[PDB]
Amino acid sequence: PGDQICIGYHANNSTEQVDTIMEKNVTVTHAQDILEKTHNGKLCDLNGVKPLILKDCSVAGWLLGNPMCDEFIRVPEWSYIVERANPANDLCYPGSLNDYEELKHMLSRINHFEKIQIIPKSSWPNHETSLGVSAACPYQGAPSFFRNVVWLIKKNDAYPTIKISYNNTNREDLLILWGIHHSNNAEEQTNLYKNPITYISVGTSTLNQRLAPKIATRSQVNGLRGRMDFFWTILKPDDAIHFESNGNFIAPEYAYKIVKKGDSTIMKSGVEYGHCNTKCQTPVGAINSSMPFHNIHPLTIGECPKYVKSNKLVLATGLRNS
């Protein structure tokens, strides 16, 4: 006998196993895993724009010019902000920044950013401009203060009522920051500003703010019972901001031109910068796209796969192996 023709199918030496709905651990000739599990372990540029990396400073310290942070650098643009989980450098003088979370969200991605001086120290001929200094903000071990703002003190035992204004002649939005100092007692209030009852008036086309110091006993933070509450606003072009105060005024000196075109968030990571580019950034590293799913980290920025709780997603492509 003989002359036989047979029908059969391919088989190889593969050990790749896939799971089906009715059967588990089915060895197949070929298979592909559609789950991304690999990251480069480096913080990268997001679509060609480098992140703004704050080494040890929070956004509040970097914005207000904490003497332990650098005095601005070549950062005219960034795609996201990298913060440490607990930045050591923050508001050195204890206090607060109003709407700090909303301010950070706006500053997460900035198209254009440039510090300028809006009010020189020559604009205060009747107040002391160099005496606004504290030991809780030392620069070279010597007491100092926030670089971008001025702590005004009485001159000649007098604090004349301030009436100053700035017209935003720039063609871009301006970010202006100012503060109010909270005294500890009545005696300290007069020693610094000579005026017992004081106020701060801030006015723009949209802003109408009145601030008064809260003089009370408070626990020591960084050796200080005093507090300073800082505030911010966005001054539109050709608009003007008006400051009026008779004490406790932390007058702005520098301001930032803001051009915002997109949005991002704040990333909390200690991973270093790798001079790379990516479409998706996770706190532990960047991941290359084209897989529909991933399991690296939930707190991603960019066009990323869908984060799942799987360790393997293996699609079967070949035949069942013998």
Partner: protein, 174 residues
């Protein structure tokens, strides 16, 4: 197992077949060898490639910035975000796992149907000029040389040529 070919009447795969997923093994006077049916192998390749690409390309991805920007007096808001992120993770994890399980079952039966269809195409041509062995092989009642074997794999097997020889063989066993 849905068509009883890959694990059924064909009990195993061929390691000697390396040029395709499905094919033929022949054994005649001129020798024995392997031949892969590329018409079926290419269509299977395109379909499996399309399925993997569809599972990948149909995913819609957008720019999102996922962080934690709510303070200690906004924990109700961040609990809303927690329920949103966890809910979406449950949706995608359940979808992804079941999508793999269902399609892996579908893909295996897709190969099963291709192998079965190959058997029926050959069987439909030979008719009674060959004997069904029930194991994926046909024993010819006539002399099928290398050119004849290629005709079976080319869908050009000529029944009238070998009819009398096959009938004589069928009577030869009587």
């Amino acid at each position: 197992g849905l068509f009883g070919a890959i694990a059924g009447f064909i009990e195993g795969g061929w390691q000697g077949m390396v040029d395709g997923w499905y094919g033929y093994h022949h054994s005649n006077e001129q020798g024995s060898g392997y031949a892969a049916d590329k018409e079926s192998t290419q269509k299977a390749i395109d379909g499996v490639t399309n399925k993997v690409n569809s599972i990948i390309d149909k995913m819609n991805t957008q720019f999102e910035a996922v962080g934690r920007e709510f303070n200690n007096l906004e924990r109700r808001i961040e609990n809303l975000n927690k329920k949103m992120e966890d809910g979406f993770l449950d949706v995608w994890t359940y979808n992804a796992e079941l999508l793999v399980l269902m399609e892996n079952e579908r893909t295996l039966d897709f190969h099963d149907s291709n192998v079965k269809n190959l058997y029926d195409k050959v069987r439909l041509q030979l008719r009674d000029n060959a004997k069904e062995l029930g194991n994926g092989c046909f024993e010819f009642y006539h002399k099928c040389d290398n050119e004849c074997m290629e005709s079976v794999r080319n869908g050009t097997y000529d029944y009238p040529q070998y009819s009398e020889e096959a009938r004589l063989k069928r009577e030869e066993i009587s």
